[PDB]
Design a protein around this ligand. Structure first.
Ligand SMILES: C[C@H](CS)C(=O)N1CCC[C@H]1C(=O)O
Ligand SMILES: [Zn+2]
Ligand SMILES: [Zn+2]
Length: 221
Protein backbone atom coordinates (compact mmCIF):
# COMPACT_ATOMS: atom_id res chain seq x y z
CA UNK A 1 0.00 0.00 0.00
CA UNK A 2 1.35 3.39 -1.11
CA UNK A 3 -0.41 6.67 -0.30
CA UNK A 4 0.57 10.13 -1.55
CA UNK A 5 -0.22 13.82 -1.16
CA UNK A 6 -1.33 15.83 -4.24
CA UNK A 7 2.01 16.71 -5.87
CA UNK A 8 3.57 13.39 -4.87
CA UNK A 9 6.16 15.27 -2.84
CA UNK A 10 5.12 13.12 0.17
CA UNK A 11 4.47 9.38 0.03
CA UNK A 12 3.97 6.65 2.66
CA UNK A 13 4.55 2.99 1.84
CA UNK A 14 3.45 0.13 4.07
CA UNK A 15 6.05 -2.46 5.19
CA UNK A 16 3.71 -4.15 7.67
CA UNK A 17 0.63 -3.60 9.86
CA UNK A 18 2.37 -0.95 11.99
CA UNK A 19 5.39 0.15 9.99
CA UNK A 20 5.49 2.48 6.99
CA UNK A 21 8.28 4.25 5.10
CA UNK A 22 7.79 8.01 4.59
CA UNK A 23 9.43 9.58 1.53
CA UNK A 24 9.59 13.31 0.64
CA UNK A 25 10.92 15.20 -2.38
CA UNK A 26 13.05 18.24 -1.71
CA UNK A 27 13.91 20.55 -4.61
CA UNK A 28 17.51 21.57 -5.27
CA UNK A 29 18.66 23.33 -8.44
CA UNK A 30 15.55 22.14 -10.27
CA UNK A 31 16.12 18.54 -9.16
CA UNK A 32 13.75 16.50 -6.98
CA UNK A 33 15.72 14.69 -4.26
CA UNK A 34 13.89 12.01 -2.28
CA UNK A 35 14.50 11.30 1.41
CA UNK A 36 13.16 8.36 3.53
CA UNK A 37 12.22 7.84 7.16
CA UNK A 38 9.86 5.61 9.13
CA UNK A 39 6.32 5.92 10.55
CA UNK A 40 5.56 3.63 13.51
CA UNK A 41 1.88 3.18 14.33
CA UNK A 42 1.82 2.37 18.03
CA UNK A 43 -0.92 1.96 20.59
CA UNK A 44 0.18 5.22 22.25
CA UNK A 45 0.75 7.41 19.23
CA UNK A 46 2.77 7.72 16.08
CA UNK A 47 6.57 7.69 16.26
CA UNK A 48 8.68 8.83 13.30
CA UNK A 49 12.26 7.96 12.43
CA UNK A 50 13.42 11.28 10.99
CA UNK A 51 11.64 14.44 9.89
CA UNK A 52 12.15 16.00 6.42
CA UNK A 53 13.98 18.63 4.42
CA UNK A 54 12.14 21.57 5.91
CA UNK A 55 9.29 22.63 8.11
CA UNK A 56 6.69 22.84 5.33
CA UNK A 57 7.19 19.18 4.41
CA UNK A 58 7.41 18.08 8.05
CA UNK A 59 4.09 19.77 8.88
CA UNK A 60 2.38 18.13 5.93
CA UNK A 61 3.84 14.70 6.75
CA UNK A 62 2.64 14.95 10.35
CA UNK A 63 -0.82 16.08 9.26
CA UNK A 64 -1.12 13.25 6.74
CA UNK A 65 -0.24 10.51 9.21
CA UNK A 66 -2.28 11.92 12.12
CA UNK A 67 -5.35 12.01 9.91
CA UNK A 68 -4.81 8.56 8.47
CA UNK A 69 -3.93 6.70 11.65
CA UNK A 70 -6.18 8.80 13.92
CA UNK A 71 -3.64 9.48 16.63
CA UNK A 72 -0.96 12.06 17.34
CA UNK A 73 2.73 12.06 16.46
CA UNK A 74 4.39 12.00 19.88
CA UNK A 75 8.09 11.33 19.19
CA UNK A 76 10.68 11.53 16.40
CA UNK A 77 14.13 9.93 16.33
CA UNK A 78 16.66 12.12 14.46
CA UNK A 79 19.43 9.99 12.99
CA UNK A 80 21.94 12.75 12.06
CA UNK A 81 22.20 16.53 11.76
CA UNK A 82 21.69 17.03 8.00
CA UNK A 83 18.66 18.91 6.66
CA UNK A 84 16.86 15.86 5.27
CA UNK A 85 16.81 14.36 8.78
CA UNK A 86 16.42 17.44 11.01
CA UNK A 87 15.00 20.15 8.78
CA UNK A 88 11.63 20.00 10.53
CA UNK A 89 12.93 20.37 14.08
CA UNK A 90 11.27 23.77 14.60
CA UNK A 91 7.91 22.21 13.82
CA UNK A 92 8.54 19.30 16.19
CA UNK A 93 9.50 21.54 19.07
CA UNK A 94 6.64 24.01 18.71
CA UNK A 95 4.08 21.17 18.51
CA UNK A 96 5.45 19.45 21.61
CA UNK A 97 6.73 16.44 19.69
CA UNK A 98 9.75 14.92 21.43
CA UNK A 99 12.83 14.95 19.20
CA UNK A 100 15.29 12.28 20.30
CA UNK A 101 18.94 12.25 19.25
CA UNK A 102 22.41 11.49 20.49
CA UNK A 103 24.27 14.27 22.29
CA UNK A 104 26.63 14.56 19.33
CA UNK A 105 23.76 15.04 16.88
CA UNK A 106 22.36 17.74 19.15
CA UNK A 107 25.86 19.39 19.40
CA UNK A 108 26.16 19.42 15.59
CA UNK A 109 22.58 20.66 15.13
CA UNK A 110 23.36 23.62 17.44
CA UNK A 111 26.64 24.36 15.73
CA UNK A 112 24.78 24.53 12.42
CA UNK A 113 22.00 26.79 13.61
CA UNK A 114 19.15 24.31 14.04
CA UNK A 115 17.04 24.01 17.14
CA UNK A 116 18.31 21.24 19.34
CA UNK A 117 16.91 17.76 19.76
CA UNK A 118 17.09 16.13 23.18
CA UNK A 119 20.54 14.55 23.11
CA UNK A 120 19.10 11.64 25.13
CA UNK A 121 20.24 8.64 23.06
CA UNK A 122 23.38 6.75 24.08
CA UNK A 123 25.44 4.33 22.01
CA UNK A 124 22.69 1.76 22.53
CA UNK A 125 19.26 2.95 23.68
CA UNK A 126 16.14 0.84 24.00
CA UNK A 127 12.78 2.59 23.81
CA UNK A 128 9.23 1.31 23.95
CA UNK A 129 6.17 3.12 22.61
CA UNK A 130 3.01 1.24 23.42
CA UNK A 131 4.00 -2.27 22.37
CA UNK A 132 6.47 -1.05 19.72
CA UNK A 133 10.10 -1.74 20.65
CA UNK A 134 12.80 0.47 19.16
CA UNK A 135 16.56 0.22 19.56
CA UNK A 136 18.91 3.00 18.48
CA UNK A 137 22.58 2.20 17.81
CA UNK A 138 25.57 4.41 17.10
CA UNK A 139 27.93 2.20 15.06
CA UNK A 140 30.66 4.79 14.55
CA UNK A 141 31.50 7.45 12.02
CA UNK A 142 30.54 7.01 8.37
CA UNK A 143 28.26 9.11 6.24
CA UNK A 144 28.59 11.64 9.05
CA UNK A 145 30.37 11.53 12.39
CA UNK A 146 27.07 11.17 14.26
CA UNK A 147 24.93 8.82 12.15
CA UNK A 148 22.83 6.28 14.03
CA UNK A 149 20.73 3.33 12.90
CA UNK A 150 17.37 2.25 14.26
CA UNK A 151 16.34 -1.38 14.78
CA UNK A 152 12.86 -2.81 15.27
CA UNK A 153 13.53 -6.12 17.01
CA UNK A 154 9.91 -7.36 16.62
CA UNK A 155 10.30 -7.21 12.83
CA UNK A 156 14.08 -7.38 12.31
CA UNK A 157 13.80 -4.18 10.30
CA UNK A 158 16.85 -1.91 10.16
CA UNK A 159 16.60 1.77 9.37
CA UNK A 160 20.04 2.35 7.95
CA UNK A 161 19.50 6.02 7.25
CA UNK A 162 22.10 7.79 5.17
CA UNK A 163 24.91 5.45 6.43
CA UNK A 164 23.42 2.88 4.04
CA UNK A 165 23.30 3.40 0.28
CA UNK A 166 20.51 2.08 -1.93
CA UNK A 167 21.18 -0.20 -4.91
CA UNK A 168 20.60 2.80 -7.23
CA UNK A 169 23.35 4.84 -5.57
CA UNK A 170 26.50 4.33 -7.63
CA UNK A 171 28.78 6.48 -5.50
CA UNK A 172 29.03 7.78 -1.94
CA UNK A 173 27.56 11.20 -2.68
CA UNK A 174 28.71 14.27 -0.80
CA UNK A 175 31.52 13.22 1.54
CA UNK A 176 32.34 16.66 2.98
CA UNK A 177 31.03 15.47 6.33
CA UNK A 178 31.96 11.80 5.91
CA UNK A 179 34.66 9.55 7.35
CA UNK A 180 35.62 7.37 4.52
CA UNK A 181 38.33 5.40 6.32
CA UNK A 182 35.94 4.52 9.16
CA UNK A 183 32.55 4.02 7.33
CA UNK A 184 33.35 0.39 6.50
CA UNK A 185 34.08 -0.46 10.13
CA UNK A 186 30.81 1.21 11.13
CA UNK A 187 28.88 -0.88 8.56
CA UNK A 188 30.64 -3.99 9.89
CA UNK A 189 29.55 -3.03 13.41
CA UNK A 190 25.92 -2.97 12.19
CA UNK A 191 26.36 -6.38 10.50
CA UNK A 192 27.85 -7.75 13.73
CA UNK A 193 25.05 -6.46 15.92
CA UNK A 194 22.16 -7.51 13.66
CA UNK A 195 22.99 -10.90 12.14
CA UNK A 196 19.43 -11.68 10.95
CA UNK A 197 17.85 -8.77 9.01
CA UNK A 198 14.72 -8.62 7.06
CA UNK A 199 14.35 -5.21 5.44
CA UNK A 200 16.89 -2.42 5.38
CA UNK A 201 15.59 1.11 4.80
CA UNK A 202 18.28 3.44 3.29
CA UNK A 203 18.11 7.22 3.76
CA UNK A 204 17.64 7.72 -0.01
CA UNK A 205 16.29 5.19 -2.51
CA UNK A 206 14.43 1.89 -2.44
CA UNK A 207 14.04 -0.43 0.54
CA UNK A 208 16.32 -3.47 0.33
CA UNK A 209 17.89 -6.07 2.57
CA UNK A 210 21.32 -6.87 4.08
CA UNK A 211 22.61 -6.55 0.52
CA UNK A 212 22.47 -2.77 0.90
CA UNK A 213 25.06 -3.01 3.66
CA UNK A 214 27.30 -5.08 1.36
CA UNK A 215 26.68 -2.59 -1.46
CA UNK A 216 27.81 0.25 0.79
CA UNK A 217 30.98 -1.68 1.65
CA UNK A 218 31.68 -2.08 -2.05
CA UNK A 219 31.18 1.65 -2.71
CA UNK A 220 33.79 2.37 -0.03
CA UNK A 221 36.53 0.49 -1.94
C1 LIG B 1 21.58 16.24 1.27
C2 LIG B 1 21.75 14.78 1.64
C3 LIG B 1 22.08 14.66 3.12
S1 LIG B 1 22.28 12.98 3.64
C4 LIG B 1 22.86 14.22 0.80
O1 LIG B 1 24.03 14.49 1.06
N1 LIG B 1 22.57 13.38 -0.30
C5 LIG B 1 21.30 13.03 -0.68
C6 LIG B 1 21.45 12.06 -1.82
C7 LIG B 1 23.00 11.84 -1.96
C8 LIG B 1 23.63 12.91 -1.05
C9 LIG B 1 24.29 14.00 -1.87
O2 LIG B 1 23.73 15.11 -2.04
O3 LIG B 1 25.42 13.78 -2.39
ZN1 LIG C 1 23.32 13.16 5.66
ZN1 LIG D 1 20.28 11.82 3.85
Amino acid sequence: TVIKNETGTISISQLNKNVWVHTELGSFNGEAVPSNGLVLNTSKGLVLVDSSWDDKLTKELIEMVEKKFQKRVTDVIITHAHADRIGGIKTLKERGIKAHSTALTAELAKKNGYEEPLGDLQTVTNLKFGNMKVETFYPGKGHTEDNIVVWLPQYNILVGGCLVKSTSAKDLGNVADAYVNEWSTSIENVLKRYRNINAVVPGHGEVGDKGLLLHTLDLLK
